[PDB]
Amino acid sequence: GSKRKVQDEVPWSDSLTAYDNEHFTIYMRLLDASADDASEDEMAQLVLGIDPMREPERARMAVRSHLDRANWMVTTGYKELFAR
Numbered sequence: 001g002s003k004r005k006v007q008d009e010v011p012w013s014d015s016l017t018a019y020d021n022e023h024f025t026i027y028m029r030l031l032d033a034s035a036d037d038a039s040e041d042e043m044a045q046l047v048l049g050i051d052p053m054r055e056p057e058r059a060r061m062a063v064r065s066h067l068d069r070a071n072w073m074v075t076t077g078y079k080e081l082f083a084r
Contacts, residue, residue: 029047044063
């Protein structure tokens with residue numbers, strides 16, 4: 001391709017996958033930044049090392065999508081969906 005798609009998404013639709021399953025350690029690193037109330041641009045640049053000047057598109061992708069499984073992996077952590 002003209003751009004490198006290394007992943008830039010979270011395995012959700014099909015199933016959780018082997019390749020990204022090796023990355024889940026960094027997921028725990030990612031959600032920590034979101035809990036700091038950091039914006040995607042901020043986080044992406046810090047946690048993914050992606051400056052949003054360089055690549056804002058994948059920056060927000062890797063942040064939002066990966067935090068999705070990071071936070072969702074803690075069933076009783078996200079008291080918003082689990083909010084009763």
